Nucleic acid binder design. Structure first.
Lengths: 178, 118, 159, 165, 179
RNA sequence: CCAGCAUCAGUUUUGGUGGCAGGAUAAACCCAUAGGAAUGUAGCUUGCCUCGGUAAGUAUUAUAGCCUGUGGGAAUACUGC
RNA sequence: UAGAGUUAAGGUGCCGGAAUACACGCUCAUCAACAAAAGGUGUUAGUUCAUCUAGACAGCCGGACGGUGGCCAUGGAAGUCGGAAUCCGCUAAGGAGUGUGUAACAACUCACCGGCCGAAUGAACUAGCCCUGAAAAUGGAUGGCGCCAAGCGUGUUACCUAU
RNA sequence: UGGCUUGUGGCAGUCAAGCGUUCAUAGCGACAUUGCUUUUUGAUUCUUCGAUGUCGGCUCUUCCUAUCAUACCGAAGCAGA
């Protein structure tokens, strides 16, 4: 089942995705960088899972491999839920691939239709909190056009809907004018 | 700031002012040391030339009522650094010695037995 | 009286007073005496065996499905006729309502003399134990002590 | 052994004049201080530094608190309006083990066998309710020992509860 | 609570989400203004009104300040503030060029302490920095804003703070005179 | 041949839903009438200061607390159907 | 020795089955995840009392008086060293003094107190959430994903639960 | 030998009266203690006899900073220095 990882928290999306992947259902998450992890920029700085001290230079020869990009976070994160250990686990992992950007131009389950939780309201809650598409910058994340442009790609998808789309709309409108 | 002080304060000024007749508000419009006591020594007997917080004596002149009226029209005289002079040493003798010293920074005016003088 | 705590973990101070109950595993419960004797029993083994004040209907369903003998497997199930009359006969208690108004009132007989077992095997309470179990006795909200009103539907599950 | 390690007591009592093959010397200089005279005479006010705990206040720290407060209370006067006491004594002789060592030693010195804590120190017991530093001090104006009970409980193990007596 | 702020004849206030504008003859200034809950988008003709339901210590802070800065923005765009500093020097003649001709959105301080070098900082928005009459010690800022105006006090002070030699003895330093 | 599991028709045991009732009791989802204590809102009038409001009267516009007297309501812990 | 009937000890955001539930609440720091002496304008509640239209309190603004250098430690002591008397003055305020300053004079500021203003402010006492005190070497290293409620108390409800 | 405690003790916070020209903390610190800690220096047979071979140095294969020196900052009872 195709969802969209856009404008809410990261963990309270990851959890919901795991129970859906469980059997073998082919859930792909689209966008990782427009999620939101919490923490400061002080404690959540030095020991953080991009490049600063820990999880980039975090390897041996026969040993780990992490990331320094806001795209690769959600991919690594959902081995860290559904492990490679069990047979269904490694099978369920392959049912998920995460994408940067929004390559589908169409509107699937995205903003209005999504599961519960997700879109937390910060009022009395929340002074400090990060964003994955801020945190990964001076970590080796460049090349914004390449990844950031993806937004530009998602735009052309919208465009395809808005067409023909625009046509059936103009019609639908004339229908009610009547 | 205790009200047992302040209650007998405004009450005492009433008793002194019922005993006397005339009033005259003093104009303390910037002084200099020795010129304060040079006012005081020309009076001496029973006058009223100390100081004392204005909000308390504002209540005294308002809550006067010896006959029927209080000290009417007195408030446009008394605002800012200001004073009074009354009680029983003779009337004109008290009145002119304020404006003996205070000709440099002069004094104001006030109702004398209350006929309004300005 | 009932039984709450298990067979294991009993020092020789509880072990003496558990003896003439003749009671093996959990839930199973005998019909004890009441005079002065009941105090010292439910002083020592108060946090082992709990009690309460049941009604007439509470110990009515109990001697029906859990209707034992000592010797011989039961042919006719435990009605009024299955006690006194029927084919052979037991002692000479009439109905189950005469059997409840025997024991709860004064108790002129014990259940071995009526030709049943010494304890009766019961059930676990439907509706559960939970928080009123081990944690404390009656005044807080516990299984132990005198459960007056609460022992009604409790034992109309353990029947 | 700091006084962190002179806190509690599995050291059980042992304190008589008959049955003792001689105690060591103590630090303790003086008991009542400031006033000798006035206990409750000049002083209807007191603070007791009442123990929460059942500790041994060792004779090391016992002199320490008392001598800090001795030197302090000279500025106000060397006989000012306080009455800082010492109460409960080192009656008990504090038994402390070592020189010890099992094998590979001079004569062998054991530890386990040779369980006798060979008498080294001295300690008082200052159990629940009890105090050493009772400070009968004056009614109006100069009360000085509320301050001087920070300086009392510092040179004392444990968390004593300050009670007005 | 809620408060009221008016607007005079030749000024136009217009808040539009958190984005505020105050209009005057010097310039038109933008900042943002919106905390938790508090809606300052309530334009009742002349009266722009801040209003919130809740209270609390840190919460009451953003009730007053959003009221204050619209009164301070009207004084800025109409009259213009004057924030006050002075160039001080010990021996060596501290030399300054201003944001005119040479300075294309920058000011400069050269011969600070004993510089053969130069310590340079840009300037902020549309601040008309009035350095000197003929010659003066005082530099005095003025502009269309409130914030951006005295930000050219910050610019100028920090870039040549007396760091590498002591402030105590060596009196080359552009210190603040008063707010 | 024991356990899982078996056509097709009728019935027990145990618990609940839903409808209804007895023990025993009357608060209520919300129930009358008379006299006395109380004091809220709308509207009007009058007084005083000020451009914004406030005080007093208002049983004589409309409505109430809490007690006393009289009269009338009243499905349920437990237990069974 | 086996399938049902009922539930303990204990769990339900997710790896991995079950509430992204319900009601009320301090707090949102990722608190949750050790630590004392000793300490704090985060932030909330209760009780008692100084204080209040008899003008609370703050800021801003003044009077800094005559006797007079009161007296006396002392080489000198000066309000301004130590110690006692404890006022007069002008009776709407200035004490025989809140703080600074020079050996000290020389110099300066003010509670006490004055003048604008006009409503609830402040000491204690008790309780809770926070907050300060706390350093070590292989790759997260006080959870994998991470959570600001998917934390926790109090009150309640539903689902899961030993031959 | 490894484990455990920190005995024997190291370090810091620090009670802060003293004493340095006046002057609790420029500095010096009576009297000592609380937390941390594992370095002076060892208490203990917990875990080990079909191996538990030593010291100073050469050579080459890590990580941390209880910090000597290099970047950046502030203060003194320090005249620039």
């Amino acid at each position: 089942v195709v969802i969209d990882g856009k404008g809410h928290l990261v963990g309270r999306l990851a959890s919901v995705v795991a129970k859906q992947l469980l059997n073998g259902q082919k859930i792909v998450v689209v966008r990782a960088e427009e999620l939101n992890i919490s923490g400061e920029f002080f404690r959540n700085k030095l020991k953080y899972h991009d490049f600063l001290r820990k999880a980039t230079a975090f390897n041996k020869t026969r040993g780990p491999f992490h990331f320094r990009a806001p795209s690769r976070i959600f991919y690594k994160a959902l081995r860290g839920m559904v492990s490679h250990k069990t047979a269904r686990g490694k099978a369920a992992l392959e049912r998920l691939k995460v994408f940067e950007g929004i390559p589908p131009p169409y509107d699937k389950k995205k903003r209005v239709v999504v599961p519960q939780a997700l879109r937390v309201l910060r009022l009395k809650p929340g002074r400090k909190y990060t964003t994955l598409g801020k945190l990964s910058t001076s970590v080796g994340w460049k090349a914004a056009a390449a990844a950031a442009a993806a937004a530009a790609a998602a735009a052309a998808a919208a465009a395809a809907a808005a067409a023909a789309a625009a046509a059936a709309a103009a019609a639908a409108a004339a229908a009610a004018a009547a | 700031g205790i009200r047992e002080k302040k209650a007998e304060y405004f009450a005492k000024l009433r008793e002194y002012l019922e005993e006397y007749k005339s009033l005259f508000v003093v104009g303390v419009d910037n002084v200099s040391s020795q010129q304060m006591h040079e006012v005081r020594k020309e009076l001496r007997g029973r006058a009223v030339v100390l100081m004392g917080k204005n909000t308390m004596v504002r209540r005294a002149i308002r809550g006067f009522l010896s006959d029927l009226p209080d000290f009417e029209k007195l408030l446009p005289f008394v605002k800012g650094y200001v004073g009074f002079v009354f009680t029983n040493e003779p009337l004109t003798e008290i009145k002119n010695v304020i404006v003996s010293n205070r000709v440099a920074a002069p004094a104001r005016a006030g109702a004398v037995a209350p006929e309004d003088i300005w | 009286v009932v039984r709450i705590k298990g067979i294991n973990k009993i020092p020789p101070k509880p072990r003496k007073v558990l003896q003439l109950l003749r009671l093996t595993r959990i839930n199973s419960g005998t019909f004890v005496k009441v005079t002065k004797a009941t105090l010292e029993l439910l002083k020592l083994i108060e946090p082992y065996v709990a009690y309460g004040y049941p009604s007439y209907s509470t110990i009515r369903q109990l001697v029906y499905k859990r209707g034992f003998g000592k010797i011989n497997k039961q042919r006719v199930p435990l009605s009024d006729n299955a006690i006194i009359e029927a084919n052979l006969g037991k002692y000479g208690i009439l109905s189950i309502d005469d059997l409840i108004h025997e024991i709860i009132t004064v108790g002129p007989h014990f259940k071995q003399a009526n030709n049943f077992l010494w304890p009766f095997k019961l059930s676990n309470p439907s509706g559960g134990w939970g928080v009123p179990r081990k944690f404390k006795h009656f005044i807080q909200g516990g299984s132990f002590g005198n459960r007056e009103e609460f022992i009604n539907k409790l034992v109309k599950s353990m029947n | 052994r700091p006084a962190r390690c002179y806190r509690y007591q599995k050291n059980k009592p042992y304190p008589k004049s008959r049955y003792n093959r001689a105690v060591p010397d103590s630090k303790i200089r003086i008991y009542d201080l400031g006033k000798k005279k006035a206990t409750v005479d000049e002083f209807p006010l007191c603070v007791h530094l009442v123990s929460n705990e059942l500790e041994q206040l060792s004779s090391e720290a016992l002199e320490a608190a008392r001598i800090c407060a001795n030197k302090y209370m000279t500025t106000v006067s060397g006989r000012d309006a306080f009455h800082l006491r010492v109460r409960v004594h080192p009656f008990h002789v504090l038994r402390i083990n070592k020189m010890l060592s099992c094998a590979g030693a001079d004569r062998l010195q054991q530890g386990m066998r040779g369980a006798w804590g060979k008498p080294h120190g001295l300690a008082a017991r200052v159990d629940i309710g009890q105090i050493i530093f009772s400070v009968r001090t004056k009614d109006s104006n100069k009360d000085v020992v509320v301050e001087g009970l920070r300086r009392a409980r510092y040179k004392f193990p444990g968390q004593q509860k300050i009670i007005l007596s | 609570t809620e408060q009221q702020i008016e607007v005079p004849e030749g000024v136009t206030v217009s808040i539009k989400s958190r984005i505020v504008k105050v209009v005057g003859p010097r310039g038109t200034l933008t900042k943002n203004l919106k905390h938790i809950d508090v809606t300052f988008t309530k334009v009742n003709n002349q009266l722009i009104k801040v209003a919130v339901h809740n209270g609390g210590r840190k919460h009451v802070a953003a009730l007053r300040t959003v009221k204050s800065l619209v009164d301070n923005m009207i004084t800025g765009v109409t009259k213009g503030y004057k924030y006050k500093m002075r160039y001080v020097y010990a021996h060596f003649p501290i030399n300054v060029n201003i944001v005119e001709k040479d300075g294309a959105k920058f000011i400069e301080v050269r011969n600070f302490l004993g510089d053969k070098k130069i310590r340079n900082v840009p300037v902020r928005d549309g601040v008309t920095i009035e350095f000197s009459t003929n010659v003066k010690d005082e530099i005095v800022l003025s502009g269309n804003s409130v914030e951006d105006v005295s930000q050219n006090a910050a610019d100028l002070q920090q870039i040549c703070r007396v760091r590498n030699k002591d402030i105590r003895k060596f009196l080359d330093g552009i210190y603040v005179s008063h707010k």
